[PDB]
Design an enzyme around this catalytic site. Structure first.
Site, PDB file in Angstrom:
ATOM      1  N   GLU A  72       0.825  -1.243   0.000  1.00  0.00           N
ATOM      2  CA  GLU A  72       0.000   0.000   0.000  1.00  0.00           C
ATOM      3  C   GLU A  72       0.843   1.269   0.000  1.00  0.00           C
ATOM      4  O   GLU A  72       0.248   2.341   0.208  1.00  0.00           O
ATOM      5  CB  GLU A  72      -1.024  -0.078   1.136  1.00  0.00           C
ATOM      6  CG  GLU A  72      -2.232   0.842   0.961  1.00  0.00           C
ATOM      7  CD  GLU A  72      -3.016   0.699  -0.336  1.00  0.00           C
ATOM      8  OE1 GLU A  72      -2.923  -0.358  -0.994  1.00  0.00           O
ATOM      9  OE2 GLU A  72      -3.679   1.705  -0.725  1.00  0.00           O
ATOM     10  N   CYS A 148      -6.025   9.603   4.975  1.00  0.00           N
ATOM     11  CA  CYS A 148      -5.057   8.735   4.250  1.00  0.00           C
ATOM     12  C   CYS A 148      -3.883   9.578   3.791  1.00  0.00           C
ATOM     13  O   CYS A 148      -4.043  10.727   3.308  1.00  0.00           O
ATOM     14  CB  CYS A 148      -5.711   7.942   3.130  1.00  0.00           C
ATOM     15  SG  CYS A 148      -6.845   6.702   3.817  1.00  0.00           S
TER      16      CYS A 148
END
Ligand SMILES: CCn1cnc2ccccc21
Length: 182
Positions: A72, A148
């Protein structure tokens, strides 16, 4: 408010930009030279906006571990006219658990945001949005959309970037020194 927030602020004030892709605005950590990181779900393309300036992407690499499992993290090299302060000496060399971390975010929606998240567990495997993901850190804070790319720090260490949550827990992808050897 205290020495953890001091280290986090020092990182935010010199080593972050606001990145915008077609999938949203993200906190983006600059690591050294013109090299930064962002969550892979930002879907970086050939062009990205950096502090609302159109910027060519010279390279983008979605990292995976040697089991070919998603990490990720995407490492981006930006066609920017200015280098980041080199913070690679603040990156951990190994997977670890941590005490007393801060999650720091800077976007149009959440400017100058700092969150004391407490204890960080080396969680390991996570099914993140349906994608098997490794090297996940976990903290017991109800993180939300807009966080995020947020930077996870302890005093003296930059340990991860926020990549998701389940409503009660938040999850970060580890940053390791070995990702940024030139
Ligand atoms: C549930 C706690 N929480 C998480 N992110 C936030 C942003 C603003 C206010 C509260 C917030």
């Amino acid at each position: 408010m205290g020495p953890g927030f001091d280290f986090a602020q020092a990182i935010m004030k010199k080593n972050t930009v606001i990145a915008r892709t077609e999938k949203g605005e993200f906190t983006m950590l600059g690591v050294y030279d013109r090299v930064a990181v962002i969550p892979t779900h930002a879907s970086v393309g050939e062009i990205i906006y950096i502090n609302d300036v159109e910027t060519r992407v010279l390279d983008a690499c979605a990292l995976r571990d040697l089991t070919d499992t998603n990490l990720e993290i995407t490492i981006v090299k930006l066609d920017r006219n200015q280098k980041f302060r080199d913070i690679r000496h603040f990156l951990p060399r190994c997977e670890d658990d941590y005490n007393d971390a801060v999650l720091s975010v800077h976007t149009s929606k959440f400017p100058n945001m700092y969150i004391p998240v407490g204890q960080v567990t080396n969680y390991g495997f996570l099914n993140l949005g349906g994608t098997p993901t490794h090297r996940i850190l976990m903290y017991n804070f109800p993180t939300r959309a807009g966080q995020c790319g947020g930077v996870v720090t302890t005093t003296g260490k930059v340990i991860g970037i926020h990549v998701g949550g389940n409503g009660a827990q938040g999850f970060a992808a580890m940053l390791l020194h070995s990702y940024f050897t030139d």
